[PDB]
Amino acid sequence: MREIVHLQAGQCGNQIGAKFWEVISDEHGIDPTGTYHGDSDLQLERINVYYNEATGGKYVPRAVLVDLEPGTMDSVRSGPFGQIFRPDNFVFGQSGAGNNWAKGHYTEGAELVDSVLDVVRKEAESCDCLQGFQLTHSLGGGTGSGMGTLLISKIREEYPDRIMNTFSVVPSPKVSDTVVEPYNATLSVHQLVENTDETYCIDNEALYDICFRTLKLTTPTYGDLNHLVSATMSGVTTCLRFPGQLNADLRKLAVNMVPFPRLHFFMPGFAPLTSRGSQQYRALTVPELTQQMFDAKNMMAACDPRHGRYLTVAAVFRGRMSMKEVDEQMLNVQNKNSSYFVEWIPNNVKTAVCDIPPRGLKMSATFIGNSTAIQELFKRISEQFTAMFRRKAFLHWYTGEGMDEMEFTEAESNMNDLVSEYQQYQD
Amino acid sequence: MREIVHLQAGQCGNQIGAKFWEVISDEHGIDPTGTYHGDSDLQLERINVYYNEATGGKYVPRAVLVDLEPGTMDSVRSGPFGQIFRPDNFVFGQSGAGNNWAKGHYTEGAELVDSVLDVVRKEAESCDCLQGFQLTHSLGGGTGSGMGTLLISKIREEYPDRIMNTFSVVPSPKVSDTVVEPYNATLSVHQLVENTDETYCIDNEALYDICFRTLKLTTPTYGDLNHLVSATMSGVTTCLRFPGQLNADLRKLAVNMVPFPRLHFFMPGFAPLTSRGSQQYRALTVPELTQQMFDAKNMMAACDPRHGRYLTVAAVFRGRMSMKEVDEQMLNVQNKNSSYFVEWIPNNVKTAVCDIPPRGLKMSATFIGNSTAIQELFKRISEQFTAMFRRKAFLHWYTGEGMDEMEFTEAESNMNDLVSEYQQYQ
Amino acid sequence: ESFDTLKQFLEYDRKVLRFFCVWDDSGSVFGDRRELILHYFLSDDTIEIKEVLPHNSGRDAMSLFLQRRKLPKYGPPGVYQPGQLTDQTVLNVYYGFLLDKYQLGKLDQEFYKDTDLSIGTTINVWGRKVLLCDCD
Amino acid sequence: RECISVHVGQAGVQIGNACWELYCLEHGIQPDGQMPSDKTIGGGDDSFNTFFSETGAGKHVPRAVFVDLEPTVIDEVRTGTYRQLFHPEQLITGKEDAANNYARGHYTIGKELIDLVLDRIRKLADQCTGLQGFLIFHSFGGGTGSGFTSLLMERLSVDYGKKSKLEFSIYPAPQVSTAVVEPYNSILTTHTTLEHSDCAFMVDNEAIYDICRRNLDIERPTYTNLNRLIGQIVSSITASLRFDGALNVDLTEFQTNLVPYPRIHFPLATYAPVISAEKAYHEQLSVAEITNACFEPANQMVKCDPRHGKYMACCLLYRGDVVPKDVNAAIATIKTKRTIQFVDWCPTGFKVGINYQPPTVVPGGDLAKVQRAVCMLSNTTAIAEAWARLDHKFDLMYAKRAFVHWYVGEGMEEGEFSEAREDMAALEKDYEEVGMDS
Ligand SMILES: Nc1nc2c(ncn2[C@@H]2O[C@H](COP(=O)(O)OP(=O)(O)OP(=O)(O)O)[C@@H](O)[C@H]2O)c(=O)[nH]1
Ligand SMILES: Nc1nc2c(ncn2[C@@H]2O[C@H](COP(=O)(O)OP(=O)(O)O)[C@@H](O)[C@H]2O)c(=O)[nH]1
Ligand SMILES: Nc1nc2c(ncn2[C@@H]2O[C@H](COP(=O)(O)OP(=O)(O)O)[C@@H](O)[C@H]2O)c(=O)[nH]1
C-alpha cells in the first residue's frame, strides 16, 4: 500500500531490468504468465507494492518500458518472463538516438515525453498511496542517460514530495565502449546532483573483479552480471513486502544516510556471494557476513574505501538472526577500524533486520555505504572530460543540436563540486 | 408491452441496419431460421419490443425496407440473418437516386410515400402499444435524405406526440466520398431540427480512429464500423426490454436532455472497448469503465468536446454493478471537469442501470452526450457550401426537378440559425 | 503463418465447384422441400449459394440465398465483441503498428473447406441441414 | 440495368469487337453464344443482363448495333470468328462510304439508313424492362464516323430525350495524319456534340502508342492492343451494374456526380495497373502506389498533361480486393500532394467506389494477372489546350480556303463552317471563364 512504479530506460537498463522481474516473480511464486503457483501465503500478503491485479487471478507488473529504437522491445517480449508485461505500456520511437545525449533529451525523446508520461501518470493513479519510482539506466549512452534524465525532471515537477529512486551504472575508467563516455556522463550528473533523492553508483570494472576472484567464474557473460545487481536493487525494498523485526522502509533510510543535500551517491554490496567450490567449506553466521560485507573487494564501485572515510553505513539483513548479535557486530567493525570512519558522527552505522530470506539462502545481507572514496570516480571522469574538451574533439554533433561551448563548462563545474564537497568533509 | 418501429432507407442506413438486427437477434437468442434457441428465460418476456410472433414460432422483425433501386435489398436478404425480414416490407422503385436531393424528396418521392406509408401503418396496428420510431439513414445522399426526410415529416403529422429516434451517419470532415455532400446536408438539416428531436450522429472518420487505436485494428472494413454503431443503438433501448434497478425509457431520455426545444443533437459511445490481446491484462470495474467513456478520443466523436461544453450527459449501465460506485463516479467527473460542464444547471448527469450484461462481457455501458461543441460539424458543412454555392455549381439538376434557388440560401440561413444557439452558452 | 493471398489465386483463379443442394423443411407449418445451388470458389475458399425456383411458385425473385463468405462449420457462431476478429495482433502503436510476438486474442474458428464438402453428405448452413446431392 | 451500345464507322466497330471478346470472356458465354455445360465460372444469377438477352434455348445474344456504310468491316465480322453470335439483321451495311466527307456521310447517303437504325433501336428497347443509357463508339476523323454520328444522335435525342449518352470516341494526335482533312471532318459535328452530349470521352492514338511502348514490353505496336485496352476500361466503367460491391455507383450517379455545369461535360480516363508479366511480379502492385501512379501525366491517354490546368472532379472506381481505409489514406496522400491543384468551388473533388470482381484478361493477351484494378475518370481544363491545336490546324488550312470544293457539291454549304468555329471559340472561352478562380 506503499507503491513503487518501475521505469526502465535504454538498452542496458532494459536488460538489467528484465532480469529484476525474474528475480521478484519467483520470490512471490508466480508463473511466467502471471498465474500464482506459490507455496507460502505471505507471498501474496504485500504483492501490491509492485503488481496490479488483472481479471482471473493473473498479476501484471507495474513497469513502463522505454526505448528510442523498436528492436529491444521485441528482445524483451521474446525473453522467458517477458510476456507478463503490459502491452499498452511498451512505448518507443522509430529512429536511433545516435548515442547522443543531445538526441535523447532534445530530438528523439523530446517528441515522446507526452506519451511516456500518459502511461506514467496513469500508473500513479491506480495506486492506493504512492511512495516511489525507480529509473534503471547507465551513464554512458544516449537513451539511458538522456531520456532517463529528462524523465526525472518530468516527474519531480509533478510529484515533488514522493521519494524517487534511481539505479545507475557509472562508466569505468579503463573499460571503454564509446570514445565519448566522459561527454555523456558529465552532462548527466548535472540533473542527478539536483533531482533524484536516492542515487547509486555501480562500476562495470569492479563487477568483473568479483566474478574473477570471489565468484571465480571462468568467463562471465552479462547475464550473471545483470543478476548481480538484481539482488541489491531488490534489497532496498525488502522491508515493504515482508514482515521485519527491525524494519526500515524506502523512506527511513534516505533521511538517515545523507547528511547534506547533495551527498547521495551510494555503493552497493551483497554479503553471501560465495564460490561454488567453497560453499561446502563455509560457515554461515552473523559475524562472518560482516567480514564479507565490509570486505573491500566485495563491493561494486571501483574506488577503494581504504582511500577515504565512511560517513554512514546501512546494512539490510535477511533471515532469522539475533538482535544483540546484529548490534554488537556493527560495533566491533568500528572499534577495530577507527580511522576510516569519520569523527563528529558517533555511531557510524545504521542497521536493519528482516525475516524472510532469499530463495535457498538460510541467511543473507546487503551493504550500502556512503564513503569519501567516490571522488575518485569523479576525478577520472573529470580529467577525461578536459582531455578531449580543450581542443573540442567530438563536439560538432552535440553542437549539431546547438549547445554552445559554455554549457559543457557550466556542467563541468557542477561535476567538480563533488570533488570539493567530499574533501570539504574528509579532513 | 411497448413496441418500436425501425425504418431502413439509403445505402448506408440499410447496411448498418442489417448489422443492427444481428446484435439484437443473438442477444435474445433466435437463429436465422426464425426459431428460438436462446439460453436464459429473460429473453422471451420482452421479446415483443422489436420482434413479432408468427404461426409456428418463426419470430419476424418489425422493419420497413425502402430503397429507390433494388441493388442493396438484393444484397440484404443475401446475408446470414437476412432471411428473417418479412417480404411485404421490401418496397422499391427501379431507378437510383443519382446522389441527388432532387430525385428523392419531391418528384419521384411522391411515387412511394403512398406505398411505404401503407406498410408502416400496417405495423402500427399489429403493434399493441407503440412508443416511437427509429430510422437509419445517411445525410449525404439521395435515398437517405430523400426518402427519410419525407417520411419523418409525414409520420409526425400522423402521430403528433411520439418520440423519434434517428441514427444519421454525418458526412466526414476531411475524408469523404461524393462532391455533392454540402447539398444533401443543408437541405435536410432544415427538416430534421424542426421535427426529429434526437439524432445520434457521429461519422465514418471518428470510427476509423477507434478502429486504429482503441481496438488496434490493422485493416478495418465496413463490416466493423456497423458493429461499432449497432451496439450503441442496442444499449440505448435496453430499459424497455430488460429489468434493472434505476431504469429509464425513451421519454425519460428526452426530458433529461432537451433544455431548449431545438438543442437535441447528441453523440454516442460504448464503454468496454479494448484491444484484442490485452483482454487478460485489464481489470474491469466501474472506476475505469467511467474512464473509457469520458474522454474526447476513445469516444465516438469527430469533434473536440474540449472546444466547448457539455450541456446534459446521460450514461446507461448494464451488468451487476453497485449504485454508490456508479453515483459517486458521476460526482468525481463533474468536479474534476467543472470548466467543461456548464454553470446554471446543478446536475448534469443522468444515470441508468440494468441487470443484464451483454454476450461475452460481465458489464457494459453506453455514453450519450449532448454538447455545445457539435456546432463545428454544422460549421464545416456551411463553409463547404458557401465556397461552392456562390458560383452556382450544380444548380441545374435541382432546377431539373423543379426546386428553386430561393430555397437553397434559405436553408443556409437555418444552419447559421442553429450554430448561434449552441454558441449562446459560452 | 501464411497470410499471403496470391499463389492460390494464380493457381486456381477461374475454377469454381458447384453442388446442387436440397433442404427438406416440411416439418414447419408451411414448409417446402427446397432446391438450391452451392458454389465454391477455389481462389479464396468462399461459398456463394443461389436460389432456383419452380414454374409458378409464390416466392419472390430475389437475387441469391447467401453472399460470398467463408462459411462456418457448426451452427451459427456467436457474434463476438468488437476488435476481436483481427488477423494480426499488435504490441503498440509507436498510424503505425508494431506486431506482437504472441497471438493472445486469436480465436479457434473452424470453416468449411473443399475436403469438408463432398457428394452424398449432409452439412449445416447456419442451422439449415442440407444434403449435397449432385455434382458436375 | 440494361444499356444500348452502337458502333459506327471503322474504328467504333473495331473497338466494339474488342469489347465483345472481353464481355464474352468476362462472363461464362462462349463464342458459340451458349453458357457451357461443364465449367462453372461461379457466375451471377442474372448478371449478364446489361449486355446480353437470354433466349429460352440458352443462346445468349448481344445488345449492340453495328452500322457502316462501307460494308467491308461488317462483311468480315459476318464471316470471322463471331459469325455465330450476332443477330443477323442487327448489322447494317451499304455500298458506298463517305471517303472523308461530312456532307457525303450526312446528306448524300445519310437519309437512306436512319429509319433502319431507329427501328432497330426501338426493337432493342422494347424487350428490356430496364434501360439506363446509350454507349456510342465512333471516330471524329472520318466522314462515316462524324456525320453519321451526328445524324443518329440528333434523331435519337429527339426520339428519347431525357437519357444519358456516353460517346467513347477517338480523337486526333499531333504529327500523325491518317487522313488529310481531319479538321474539316472533325469540327462540324462539334456543334451537335456540345448541343447534346453528356460524357464525351476522348481517347488519343499516340498516347496509347507510347504507353504500350514503355509500360509494356511492346515495340512496333498495332491496333488490336489499343482496342483491348480501351475495352478493359469500358468494362471497368460498366462493372457497377453487373457486379455488386461495398460502394458502387451507377451511370446517372456519376453523370450527376462529375458534371458541374451543363456545358462542361468532357472528362478524361486512365486505367492504372497496365504492365507486362515479367516486370509485374517483381513489384508489389499495392493500392497506394497504384493510385499514385494513376496520377502521372505520362500514364494518361490524351497527350494534354494535367500540370497546366487544375482538376475539378475525379471518380475512382475500384475492383478487386480493396479495403476502404486504403483508399481513404490514398485520398489523404493525394490531398497533401503539392503539384495536383484543384479549383476553389469544389471543396471535396473526389468520388470513390469499390467492387468485388478482379480484372480479367483475355488469353493470348498483353496484360498481367493482377489481383486489383482501379480506373479514374477525371475532368481538367487542359482539353481546351488540346483543342487550340485543332483551331490553329483549321485556321492555316482555311486561310487558302483549301478544299471546300468537295464540300460545296454535297448538301451543306459554307455557312455552317463559321458557326462551328465560333462555337468552339465560345467553348474554350467558357473553359477559361470556369477555370478562373473567383
Ligand atoms: N481503334 C482503331 N481506330 C482506328 C483504326 N483505324 C482508324 N482508326 C481511327 O479512325 C480515323 C480514320 O478515319 P475513320 O474513322 O477510319 O473513317 P470512317 O469513320 O470509317 O469513315 P470512312 O472514311 O468513310 O470509312 C483515324 O484517325 C483513327 O484514329 C483502327 O484500326 N482501330
Ligand atoms: N550489467 C549489464 N550491463 C550491460 C548489459 N548490456 C550492456 N551493458 C553495459 O551498458 C553499457 C553501455 O550502455 P548504453 O551506452 O547506456 O546503452 P544505450 O543507452 O542504448 O546507448 C556498456 O558499457 C555495457 O557494459 C547487461 O546486459 N548487463
Ligand atoms: N458503415 C457503413 N458505411 C457505409 C456503407 N456503405 C456506405 N457507407 C457510407 O455512406 C456514405 C455515403 O452513402 P450514400 O451514397 O450517401 O448512400 P445513399 O444515401 O443511399 O445515396 C459513404 O461515405 C460511406 O462511407 C456500409 O456498408 N457501412
Ligand SMILES: [Mg+2]
Ligand atoms: Mg469504313
